[PDB]
């Protein structure tokens, strides 16, 4: 188990139960310690947060065809964030928020992370990355990170095989039952996972 | 005894044979148990819908000898007891108004060595003040031989001063109209007895014994069985001073031929005297049967006593002889149940309870029926006949004939007899009967008139109020019942009218109240019963209102998750009188859009433009709040309508100030920008938007909160009416009126309390006022603080940080740029 001890962690609307900022502490230590760095956050709905620490992260049907399927993750919070709540109305009518997570992968992969300037949509993009990966799209035990769009804030994508491989736990960043579609205000952050947040350096030349 | 339906009807078709009355006792004084006795003897049984007991059918036969002592109109030996339940403390003021309302007779409870406590006294000043006759029962007489062990004569004393006492207040308090009510042991208006043992006398009972061994007609026998009379044992003569010839004292005669028979048996028994028991049993004619031969100390007492005189027929003894039936109350009661003209032809057919006029039947509350949630009428046909199937008026609590306000032109679907805890279907019922409908619960919330007269006014109305202002959070202490409260709290709401269980955002579990007893109640019966699940309940708290002061400083602004959908709006205050409007129906969500603009645009000043584009109503989608869609050529705009309105209905449930309802709040959209393509402008877009925009514009213009007001009414002697200004005084109360009672010295004066200051009222009330007042309190209004809720010294936001904190919320309240577009 990496979620540090404590008594049992779940996701509420009302915050996630059993997760202090000194729980993370403890947790990211030992995850470093086995060898596992973090390389980014996730936003998710209450539901999918559970599965993913308690069943891990898994690709289920995804189009075959579709080129840029995988597991997309953000170094900075806050574009995160925005991903942190229910993507439709429950039959009454409430959109709920979600939750901050934090994703870790085997330090041994990293070889496998890149980075580039273009945008992951345009057209170069697709033959770029290839060229960095050394292999046609999709990502596979690799990863891509570069601009959400242009000028826009960064986003990762860890390709399923190695999304498959992460380890992922709560974070102490908590979403904002009272104002759902907001924007992560950045006082919210604990200074003490600020600490913990650096990102890997991802190499911009091939291997 | 069992009856069927038509001896049933039969026997309510005998009106003046009929008594409507209600049981004035303290629950320490034995009330439940008198009572029971009466059922466990003349209760009526029929010859699977249950409901919640109300009114106990009672049956008694007299002798046409006895049918002659009654001093009014009757008919036939046999006699209908119609016995309303009453509450077990007085705290319940509205609805011990109730009961009494439609009873005319009423058995008062007094004890033997405590006398008219505070409470019985005044339950009986409510009691005289709707014109009931009283009739007395002083019980608990055991304890006055078995632990005082008083003499023959003390216990005389004692009750001698304790009916001079209630004649005090019999005198004092009842109508001078209605004629000398008080009680008078020598003509049968009052009973001793004990409940316990399950005995009971009258004067009127042992004069009929005595009654040939002196020769005498028992009027005369019963008269000097009470009072100054002596028989000399000796010269066996009748006289008026307590001593003969010589100067020797003599024994009373009430001593004499009551209390000594009595006192011999308990002194013989309770000393297990085996000798004398059989001889001193065998002369009073006691007759042991087998096994209750044996019995001895308290054991047999209790059943010798019970055979001796039993307490059940003691009191339906007086009931039937000395309480009034439907027809002789109705007649001098009438003027004071009508709320018309006193020669109205309704008022006229009241004091006539004339079976042929247009239809007068009061409603006094509404019971919980095992048939789904749905809720019996219970009430009195003061007037012509109800029948099933019969098409009524029903007129509810702000009805008046003018108008067509708070009416519903329904049909009864059937008129049930409220045997207790079972219903008994029957056709029709004329005035004078206490009856049950069925199918009125959607109509008729807890009280209300039903007529047939389109110009009858409706008949002293009892205000209630279904405004939740106090409410709680309940938690299972043992997360495994968890299941077992999500189902209580479901039954809870549904066996009470006014209790409401819901579920917050946060996801907590809350149970609101019309006030703090009512409340408390409310979770007791939670916890032991719809339940019986241990929980964990949060202090009691005030349901506060959020609102606006003005229009939106500036135009409010968000954008969905996509940023490709925008919502342009402003909010702006809704008039008090709107707001009152749509509270009480006359501005309806289920109107015609063009009527109801009519409506709005006429009586209320807006512009029937504006009012034809309301989109909904929230909270629930009818609360007072509106969103008018002022958008000018927004393609897709109606695309977006149902999510817009979702957004409306969580935005006005819990408002941004600190979670709290919203209230008179107008949100105008002015724009809209959304995207071509429908897979980005669904719910999980637009009502986040439309959500938080709501509250942009809401803290944009000008935020206050509104505190509920209470509206109590207190009825108190001359002499505490002081107590209550002293009181009020403490409490931010504001007095509205102050009147008193013609003839007696009975003030009755009427306050607003803040509900936020009404916690633990009743009880300051009762020291301050020596327990001699009787409050009332309903929901009046809600009131607007001027502070403001956003400086946390204010003493508004002293409420808001406080309430923010308990939520566990951010201590300082959000502005609005946090739901403004972040630009």
Redesign the interface.
Known sequence: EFLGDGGDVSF???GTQNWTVERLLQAHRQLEERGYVFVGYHGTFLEAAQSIVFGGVRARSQDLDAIWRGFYIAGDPALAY??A?????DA?????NGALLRVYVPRSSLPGFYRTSLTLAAPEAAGEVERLIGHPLPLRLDAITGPEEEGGRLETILGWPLAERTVVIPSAIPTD???????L?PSSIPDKEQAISALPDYASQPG | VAFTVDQMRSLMDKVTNVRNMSVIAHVDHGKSTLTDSLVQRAGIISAGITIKSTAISLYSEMSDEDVKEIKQKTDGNSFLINLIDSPGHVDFSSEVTAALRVTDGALVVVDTIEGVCVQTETVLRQALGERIKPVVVINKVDRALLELQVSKEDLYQTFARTVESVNVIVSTYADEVLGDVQVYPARGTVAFGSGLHGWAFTIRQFATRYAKKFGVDKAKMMDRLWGDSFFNPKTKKWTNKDTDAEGKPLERAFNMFILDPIFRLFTAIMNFKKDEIPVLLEKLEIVLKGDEKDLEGKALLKVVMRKFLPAADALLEMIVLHLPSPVTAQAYRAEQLYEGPADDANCIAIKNCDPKADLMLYVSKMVPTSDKGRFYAFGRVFAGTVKSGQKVRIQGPNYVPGKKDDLFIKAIQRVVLMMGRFVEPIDDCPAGNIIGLVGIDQFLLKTGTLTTSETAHNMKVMKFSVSPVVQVAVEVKNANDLPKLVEGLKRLSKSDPCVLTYMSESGEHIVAGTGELHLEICLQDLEHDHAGVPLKISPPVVAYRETVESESSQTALSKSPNKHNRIYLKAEPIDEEVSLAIENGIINPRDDFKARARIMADDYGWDVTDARKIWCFGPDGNGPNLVIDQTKAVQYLHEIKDSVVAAFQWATKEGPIFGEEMRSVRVNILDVTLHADAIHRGGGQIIPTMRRATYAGFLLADPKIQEPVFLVEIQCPEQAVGGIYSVLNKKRGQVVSEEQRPGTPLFTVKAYLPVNESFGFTGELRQATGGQAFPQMVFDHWSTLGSDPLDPTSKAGEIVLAARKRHGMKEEVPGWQEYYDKL
């Open positions: 509420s609307t009302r925005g991903y709540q229910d993507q439709e109305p009454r009518g409430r959109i709920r039952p009272r104002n759902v579609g907001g924007d205000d």
